[PDB]
Design a protein around this ligand. Structure first.
Ligand SMILES: Nc1ncnc2c1ncn2[C@H]1C[C@H](O)[C@@H](COP(=O)(O)OP(=O)(O)OP(=O)(O)O)O1
Ligand SMILES: Nc1ncnc2c1ncn2[C@H]1C[C@H](O)[C@@H](COP(=O)(O)OP(=O)(O)OP(=O)(O)O)O1
Ligand SMILES: Nc1ncnc2c1ncn2[C@H]1C[C@H](O)[C@@H](COP(=O)(O)OP(=O)(O)OP(=O)(O)O)O1
Ligand SMILES: Nc1ncnc2c1ncn2[C@H]1C[C@H](O)[C@@H](COP(=O)(O)OP(=O)(O)OP(=O)(O)O)O1
Ligand SMILES: Nc1ccn([C@@H]2O[C@H](COP(=O)(O)OP(=O)(O)O)[C@@H](O)[C@H]2O)c(=O)n1
Ligand SMILES: Nc1ccn([C@@H]2O[C@H](COP(=O)(O)OP(=O)(O)O)[C@@H](O)[C@H]2O)c(=O)n1
Ligand SMILES: [Mg+2]
Ligand SMILES: [Mg+2]
Ligand SMILES: [Mg+2]
Ligand SMILES: [Mg+2]
Lengths: 745, 745
């Protein structure tokens, strides 16, 4: 008949338009009514309406229209967040316990199987404790997310039932706290309130599988080859298949595979090298997706540069060429020793050999690698001799073209790690921050936890240090409770992760801490500031693991580590820390009790986590002050809201200032309406000299017991800033030369 | 200095040209000197000579030039064979024993490893018995190969040392007879003389690895999936990797993998189907090569047509489209039941379902499959309904475009096999002749042995039957000795191949037996003839396995088979055999002693084996009377030498008759110089109606206890001859509808 809409109860009515403005103005309380205008939003919604429309599409399109209108006044972000979050909170259930009973009592709607979303012990903990725990949840905190962080949180992370999302966000975060803190409830309420107050957040597989039926909370996996045979290659392929099933990240050390042309004693033939093998890993990276297709399964391939197939390895992730000689859905990385640095330095030659001819090489680092490599370089057992600057030119061609390979430094990582007593660290994970020991028997597993920073900044614009160590103590107790609950997908993972027991802590949003502390990025108080911050994080981490080892005893391989010898991570950098803390009593209690976890700190990139909480990616500056937004039918420009927060107060903001920053791509310094302080507080990273950031990485990574991601931003391809940049990173002592060479077009 | 050639001792001399004609005329004894001309060969050799040439290149180019001059007179084939074979027999050693000591005493020339070419027990058998066995070898038989068969035999099959071939052909065939007949010598000399007199030959992995260090003599491997999980898929991928390492042929039953969109209870997602999985098997088929790169590892993928992904499965081996939706280095095949035949027959509908929804389907054949498929077709549990002639049109589009898929008939194979007591035969091998039971526990392995035919034709033009059964007895004793010596690459292979113990016998060159018996291909004595031949082969095979079971007892699962119930293979076809033999006493001795091997006869294609011995491919007619030859710088036309043998006697051959058959592509029937008998004795297969060949396949395959290859030759794409051809093959009862749709351009 007429234009009827399908009202959410399931019924239909006539189109009465004042229900829209009746609802929006109800959801506009507490905003600037001088620019909050329900009529424009209603008008663009009615531009899209038709007959027979479910009303949840009208609320979705209402929040979408408010998100597109956010450019006119910044309160429409708060409005659009209230529209989407109110749309969800009207939909699903109020009580957490009946949601959990609905998830456990799930039935596959065409197979009849009692196929739960949560394990029965999780439901046991909930139903035994629902009275305190339903009282602990606070739904006032769900209106605190950004809109785009809420849509990113909704599209993939909330547990769905037949396509309809059936979890509020506090149901997910309380589900995580039950999923980790099993027996105890006080830790679940301190962990819940410290969690939902957005102080720290766990990693994404923890948000996937906390308390579910297959609890695989880990996110870091480091695998090396079992053998240089078909059985080793395909058994390693099997382990990468299972681990990439249970939503992990896999970095593979592929150093020990014989090269093209070496003799095969079994079938009297010659090998074809690494290129079809890594092509098999290419199709495996396409087939298995992490979890329920939530993100594609990605593999890192690490190769040391002395291997003979290095040129076809570097020409492998490209765009042109034959298709059968490209494997472009992987991530390639070079695990470079100091000798290739020295031979590129003085234009000498370089010996590409085959690890069947020269066996047992990648397990040897430093001066011993110099002696063994020189002794094989003497005997003439090598196969090819290439001038080192030619291969360096090939590396800069590959990084210039695609950004791959990554570059890590072998002797720097093997020298400055707490797992020296085990052997030689072969590889690292996909995002190049977990530097741990791998073997044929031990497959390295590490857990993650990302602390935010800008929630700690007080109103005095003086940073809070004493809170940060305290939350770090709660985090270390969380991860150390994670390691003993996790279900490892392969049997080699449990022995490594329970013998050595590592954790991982990484912060996100350093640029917001600098803006809210009101310092320039290349100032003196910034370089003092991050140094003091990671002294606080590192100190509180060591105090927390000390207080755990006082209660459960240290890990199984402690005596032999340099921490048992008193050398902490900063002395391996030979940098005495500041007088901000008391390190003597810390080293006394460590010398009397040990520590519980081997490796502690690890700055991860946190793309998706910082996408949720609105912070910037972990430590880098803003890419531009204008950042785009992916909206259906609108992909548009939103300025940095801290910059806009200062501009509305300083008066220089007007109705075309956005258009004034369109034609400069974030560069606010070219405009004549300038207080000449925003040019220091809001430096575009393209307008930031990279070597100051590298010095800041030398200080901060000098207070980190693992590596850290390092997105290199360079506007134009030039070999001097690249070559001097990598050599400068090697001279400062960094464990990671690069993670991406990013060139803006 | 001057033009010096490097004489084979390693020295150098001046170019003296009468050494060439001094040698060729020495190697021309016994030929037609009216057309044997050393001066033309010498002239074209000296066209290629230069300074500093090793003289073995001069003999190689001499045999090559004689091979190109063979068109002028057929004795230059005998000449070129004598040149190449004399070139090899001047080179390597005369004594077999010192060759074997050289192979076992091999050392890798840059690793020092005593890496043998033969096992130490083989050398023990040789050195304990070298006195009789060096006397048994006859080097007069090496001048009996064709030239192109000798070059094909030399480039890949003779065991090389550092690129230089160090085996005479009788060294290889005697190496095979030592490699099979281990303790006994009389069987090695009867097997050697019956072998090197070119009566029968083993399969190609037997020629690869007889008596070597990794004895993997088998050539047929049938694998099904362990599980519909990641562990089953990648464990099956591991087994296909090891088996394709040790030079086997792998056919995989991929029926039991869930389709696109089905729910995954582990990670709450949906599967992507079969297309990326078979893309992973595509790169695995590219990476692992069979043996020492001797032929590329190929996989067969069998799918039953009721699976939901059947359309993307059929559009998968093509040329155009996106690259990520194609897997073209595989071989695809449909395992069709009778219901798709009946629904295509009467234009009805067809139910594409998912084997997670409808479990346990491919293990059910015939009327029970009709009942179970109708019961799932009733409940509405199916997912798609497609008109059957549409999918049949897609099949004819795929076979028309590339020739894949193959077509096998499920109920026909499950009904007419001796392994009915085990369960349901899921799949078959790559070349579609081995129809055996596969399981999660039993991986099917079958050995092969190809008998030639035209060596049996006596001078009376009456075929020898009593010899053929006798050589068949020697063959069955050979293969039954092969099964107990073989080293299976996976542990599931040994249990199947020792419980059920199958063998495989296939003949090659039926067209030569018809020409040497002087009958037309579509005559009456041809259809009588092959029927009598396979009654002889089948009878002698059953008598041989009976006489083995009289001595060792039948296999472990005999009682339950229809042979124990007295029904042989011909009664499953309901065709009483001829009165050529005595079947009553055979069935009495089988009824009193059983048989040793379950399945016996299997016509394989034998591309490479018939390429060696000069026979035609197994049972098909000649593709054309003119067949080309691959020669370096000359790829030219040589007529069928039996046709030429009749033409030089009947006088109609002249110096331009080749040019008269150029413009007709083998069709000798269009020329006016015709005795009108060669038009019957030498029918081009494009000039042969296919349904007579299908009737001949109904008779011959009615006397075969497994399937047989069937190369379908049709000159133009037409749907009536295709559709009526497959339906005609289903009406005759054949186990294999097609193996290739070949269209000449
Ligand atoms: N009769 C209507 N015609 C057109 N749009 C409507 C109508 N009623 C509501 N809408 C719009 C207003 C909102 O933008 C959106 C959702 O309305 P909403 O009131 O929340 O559904 P609902 O009526 O079931 O919720 P509730 O019953 O709790 O009020 O649909
Ligand atoms: N058929 C093959 N095709 C391509 N590569 C192969 C093949 N077989 C082996 N390889 C590669 C895989 C490994 O990188 C390497 C050695 O495999 P492996 O099984 O250890 O050889 P092997 O043990 O039979 O001889 P070796 O003793 O020299 O290692 O050669
Ligand atoms: N001096 C020569 N100059 C050019 N070609 C030669 C010369 N001698 C021989 N040839 C050709 C003739 C043959 O086609 C080919 C091989 O000759 P061949 O006699 O078999 O080498 P060889 O002399 O070492 O063998 P052998 O010592 O047993 O006689 O080279
Ligand atoms: N991450 C993935 N990406 C793509 N396909 C997958 C993935 N995980 C599983 N599959 C496919 C492979 C199999 O065809 C199918 C079932 O695998 P399987 O391990 O049995 O699932 P599961 O056991 O965890 O859940 P279920 O009990 O329903 O099988 O799903
Ligand atoms: N595309 C990606 C990126 C990271 N990761 C894994 O997640 C870890 C940290 O990356 P991250 O914190 O940015 O991942 P998110 O938590 O943001 O999803 C890495 O060590 C990888 O193991 C992944 O599996 N897939
Ligand atoms: N390209 C091929 C052809 C056949 N084969 C295997 O060899 C068996 C018989 O084929 P064939 O007799 O033509 O092989 P050859 O002996 O001629 O080399 C088949 O069952 C396959 O298992 C193979 O592995 N690769
Ligand atoms: Mg309403
Ligand atoms: Mg080996
Ligand atoms: Mg000579
Ligand atoms: Mg499963």
């Amino acid at each position: 008949s007429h234009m009827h809409v399908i009202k959410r109860d399931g019924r239909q009515e006539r189109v009465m338009f004042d229900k829209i403005t009746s609802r929006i103005q109800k959801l506009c309380y507490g905003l600037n009514m001088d620019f909050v205008d329900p009529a424009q939003i209603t008008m663009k919604v009615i531009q899209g309406l038709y007959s027979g429309v479910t009303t949840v599409e009208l609320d979705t399109l209402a929040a979408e229209t408010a998100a597109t209108l956010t450019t006119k006044h910044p309160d429409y972000a708060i409005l659009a967040a209230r529209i989407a979050v109110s749309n969800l909170h009207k939909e699903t259930k109020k009580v957490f316990s009946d949601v959990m009973e609905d998830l456990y009592n799930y039935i596959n709607p065409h197979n009849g199987k009692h196929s739960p979303m949560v394990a029965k012990s999780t439901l046991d903990i909930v139903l035994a404790n629902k009275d305190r725990l339903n009282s602990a949840i606070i739904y006032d905190r769900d209106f605190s997310y950004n809109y785009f962080g809420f849509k990113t949180l909704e599209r993939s992370y909330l547990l769905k039932i037949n396509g309809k999302v059936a979890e509020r966000p506090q149901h997910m975060l309380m589900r995580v706290s039950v999923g980790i803190h099993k027996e105890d409830i006080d830790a679940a309420i301190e962990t819940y309130n410290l969690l939902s107050e957005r102080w720290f957040t766990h990693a994404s597989p923890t948000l996937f599988n906390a308390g579910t039926n297959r609890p695989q909370l880990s996110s870091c996996f480091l695998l090396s080859m079992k053998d240089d045979s078909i059985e080793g290659i395909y058994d390693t392929l099997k382990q990468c298949a299972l681990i990439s099933k249970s939503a992990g990240g896999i970095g593979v050390a592929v150093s020990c595979i014989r090269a093209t042309g070496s003799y095969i004693a079994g079938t009297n033939g010659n090998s074809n090298g690494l290129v079809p093998m890594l092509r098999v890993y290419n199709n495996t990276a396409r087939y298995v997706d992490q979890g329920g297709n939530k993100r594609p399964g990605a593999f890192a391939i690490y190769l040391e540069p002395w291997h003979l197939d290095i040129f076809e390895f570097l020409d492998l992730k490209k765009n042109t060429g034959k298709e059968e000689q490209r494997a472009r859905d992987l991530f390639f990385a070079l695990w470079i020793p100091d000798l290739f640095m020295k031979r590129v330095e003085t234009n000498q030659d370089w010996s590409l050999m085959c690890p069947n001819e020269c066996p047992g090489l990648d397990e040897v680092w430093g001066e011993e690698f110099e002696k063994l490599y020189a002794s094989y370089e003497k005997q003439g057992r090598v196969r090819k001799v290439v001038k080192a600057q030619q291969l360096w030119y090939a590396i800069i061609e590959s990084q210039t073209e695609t950004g791959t390979p990554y570059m890590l430094y072998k002797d720097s990582c093997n020298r400055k790690s707490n797992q020296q007593n085990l052997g030689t660290i072969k590889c690292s994970n996909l995002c190049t921050e977990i530097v741990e020991y791998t073997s044929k028997d031990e497959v390295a597993v590490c857990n993650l936890a990302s602390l935010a920073l800008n929630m700690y900044v007080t109103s005095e614009h003086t940073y809070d240090f004493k809170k940060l160590a305290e939350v770090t103590k709660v985090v270390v107790r969380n991860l150390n409770k994670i390691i003993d609950i996790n279900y490892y997908p392969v049997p080699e993972a449990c022995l490594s992760n329970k013998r050595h027991r590592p954790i991982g802590i990484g912060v996100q949003g350093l640029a917001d801490a600098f803006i809210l502390m009101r310092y320039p990025f290349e100032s003196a108080e910034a370089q003092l500031l991050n140094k003091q911050i990671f002294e606080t994080i590192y100190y509180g981490a060591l105090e927390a693991s000390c207080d755990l080892a006082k209660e459960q005893g240290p890990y199984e391989t402690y005596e032999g580590s340099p921490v048992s010898k008193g050398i902490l991570q900063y002395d391996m950098w030979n940098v005495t820390p500041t007088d901000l803390w008391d390190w003597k009593v810390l080293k006394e209690k460590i010398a009397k009790y040990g520590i519980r976890n081997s490796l502690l700190i690890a700055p991860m990139p946190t793309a998706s986590t910082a996408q949720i909480l609105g912070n910037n990616e972990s430590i880098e500056p803003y890419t531009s002050n204008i950042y785009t937004r992916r909206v259906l039918s609108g992909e548009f420009q939103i300025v940095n809201p801290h910059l806009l927060k200062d501009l509305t107060e300083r008066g220089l903001w007007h109705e075309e200032m956005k258009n004034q920053i369109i034609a400069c791509n974030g560069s606010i310094q070219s405009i004549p309406e300038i207080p000449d302080d925003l040019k220091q507080l809001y430096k575009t990273v393209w307008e930031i000299s990279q070597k100051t950031v590298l010095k800041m990485a030398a200080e901060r990574g000098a207070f980190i017991d693992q590596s850290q991601s390092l997105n290199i931003h360079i506007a134009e391809p030039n070999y001097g800033k690249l070559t001097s940049m990598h050599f400068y990173g090697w001279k400062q002592g960094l464990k990671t030369g690069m993670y991406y060479l990013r060139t803006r077009p």
